[PDB]
Design a protein around this ligand. Structure first.
Ligand SMILES: CC(=O)[C@@H](O)[C@H](O)COP(=O)(O)O
Ligand SMILES: CC(=O)[C@@H](O)[C@H](O)COP(=O)(O)O
Lengths: 252, 246, 244, 245
């Protein structure tokens, strides 16, 4: 027996692709800012948005307008460059996730190469922390990178669920799932909080939300994709409900 | 499908009957529920025709793309209508106070012969029969003795529970009642009073074949739209079931 | 501009059929306002068949727009209305002795009662409306009561069995609107209106507000409440603006 | 009484962002028909920026209403349009050398090319619309090409920065319609129209069909696709019918 309760597993909603849609036409709509606040009303525990150097989807006005309006938590994804880090320390989001943008900054799987850029990342982690931001590193589920993330001082890691999501068949999906599971264990063993989310959708998130060690799933595209047919409030509420049901039933 | 959802459409008819027009149309509701993931449509032709009326059942029966579950009382008029229509499934429910226990399930012990004969009459018309009963040892045992292959447990007290403690105690009656029915070779269903925050623990029980759910879906549908309400409930149950199996 | 009043009564109907708190008429009202409703309407019946007293009391201080309280001409219900101080009250017939055969309030027949109820609600700062048939004599009686608003019974128009009958019943409403506006009355409508018969009524310039209930709930079950309300509002505004 | 063409380009825009099959432009198309759309519109661009050949090829046999294919006046795409045999085609500018400063197809300037294209498509049984500005010189030339339909560029109306500018531009669209009907053309519109500016355009009795794209997808994100389509149609019908009576 158990009580269902929303605190069991947090959902971060990524609003980037609402921006993709708005930028397509050039008007202010559909508004990413309204998207974020409506997601909070629908049960999102944080709002996630990636301010790219090249400002391809989310733009600066989106971040600056939304920051003071946020009811829950802002999770600002950004690159490890001095100028973006300055923006992050000025805006003071509750959380930040350091993500690679330039190819020299990522691995072949797609996570931050914390190993190869160790000093720069440890410094970023320090200044963000000095400005009161809880820092996460978006990394591959590779034990060396996880260990390296822990050495940087970052309290959080976000594991890259892309290969899990894009698995070609069930045998390959299970293998990638095991990489994630053992990534979570190694991260927890070092006292890191561990998140996930990349590529997760309405039929592959359950197996991930059933992992007791995961704190928060940060989900973007799939929610927007489901919203077009179903409506934003419902797409959010539904993904949250599925996550919570998987989490709780797997615990007891 | 890891677990089946039957969507009950009675309270769509409640809305319709309040106005006297054909809208909102229960028949549309039922076919759309199937399109959004329902494995069966449940409907209760009461003797007093309070919500669902005969024409709703007759129109729906040849259209249904999954399974029809007809709820009805144990009386000749209704049983004969059921045998004429030949739904895939029927669930015998009480409509008179003399037919129900205080908990509100069918009093199979007190009306054993009438119920056992009903079971025979429907089984002859090719209908899979279920008895709507309390999670009560005596009633479960009696149900097995009627020859009906299915029971649906009355999850009302569980659903209506006020505290964590009271709901825990009622949950274990249901869990116990599932184990008992399975041990006698019955399929066990549930669903009365189940909604979007109490369905998960019941779906987590692997012995439950199908949850037949009504008012919670229609109530949520008002705000969220019917396709979404059904889909979401199905998603939550499957997530609960499969996560608990592994 | 044309106003939509959303009647939440049949949300309460769905709730009372199971005995839980859901669907919550209070939440339905507050979300109708978010979706564009200009007022919320609810009929506290003497027999509390759908909406109940706790519904009206809980919602009243939360209203961001206007509350239109439908109730009968009896002292208890008038006492409750004067205590709640809704923005609007619409006096409706409940007893068979208060009904015309068409179904509106017999204001001619209960003039003194209705006038006193008007004075009583007006003293409590409530803008009073009388639900009536599109009948010139009732419209006149309505005006003599001192009520500033009338709501015309569009149910015959709504339930017309064919186009000829529907057009004649439309002409009656149109004439009623002219008659009521010629006396200084605000005129409302809405009984039985839905998504393919509201347009013609919305197109009449003299209509201030359409108070619509069951059609929005029936649509919302498939479409969602927010959508159903916003859509009715948009259709109404489309019709009105194009008509001018 | 008035038709709604639902343009599905920006559903694909959303799909290509991620590189999976979702959200599926084909599903959107079919669900729009169920919601009341009279036609499905898609622009197969020469660079394939949103809609791709698979979308158009897979959607075509499944279309229950009619397909309106937007494509450019060049052999490759015209040859494709003839393969697909959509019910309607709308010729539109894609290169800087084919469009006016306002953004319409420079029909007067590419007359021989457009006339040939109208011939080729009509001989494949496709009914041809030309996307043009509401300028008399271009409407007259459109008629000269043999094309039975024109679609007026409502973008300047839609982008108007004040009430006065919006009246001026509205008058251009209105007189553009008169001028087109006078030559026996069917006249459409659609570019830039949304849920608070479509009404004045829908009130014009001469307008056959509104082809609307981005406003619906943008609304759909919050309210759901079926609802955004149905609601656009109902506002169009409401405004049209009330304008007639
Ligand atoms: C489908 C719909 O939109 C409903 O509103 C319905 O078709 C009419 O409602 P009535 O029940 O009021 O006739
Ligand atoms: C305001 C709204 O909800 C959108 O539906 C609107 O369509 C915006 O349209 P634009 O794409 O024209 O800004």
């Amino acid at each position: 027996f158990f009580l269902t309760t929303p605190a069991a597993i947090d959902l971060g909603v990524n609003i980037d692709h609402v921006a993709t849609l708005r930028n397509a036409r050039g008007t202010a709509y559909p508004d990413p800012v309204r998207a974020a606040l409506a997601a909070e009303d629908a049960g999102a525990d944080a709002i996630t948005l990636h301010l790219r150097e090249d400002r391809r989807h989310i733009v600066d006005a989106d971040v600056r307008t939304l920051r003071p309006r946020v009811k829950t938590r802002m999770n600002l994804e950004c690159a490890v460059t001095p100028e973006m880090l300055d923006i992050a320390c000025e805006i003071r989001p509750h959380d930040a996730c350091l993500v690679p943008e330039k190819r020299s900054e990522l691995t072949t799987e797609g996570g931050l190469d914390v190993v190869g850029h160790f000093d720069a990342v440890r410094a970023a982690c320090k200044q963000l922390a000095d400005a009161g931001v809880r820092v996460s590193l978006f990394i591959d589920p590779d034990e060396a990178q996880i260990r390296a993330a822990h050495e940087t001082g970052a309290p959080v890691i976000e594991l890259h669920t892309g290969r899990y999501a894009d698995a070609h068949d069930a045998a390959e999906q299970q293998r990638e799932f095991e990489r994630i599971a053992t990534g979570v264990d190694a991260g927890i063993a070092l006292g890191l909080k561990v998140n996930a989310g990349h590529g997760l959708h309405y039929t592959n998130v359950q197996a991930i939300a059933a992992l007791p060690g995961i704190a928060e799933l940060n989900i973007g595209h799939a929610i927007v994709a489901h919203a077009v047919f179903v409506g934003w409030d419902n797409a959010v509420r539904e993904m949250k409900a599925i996550m919570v049901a998987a989490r709780v039933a797997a615990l007891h």
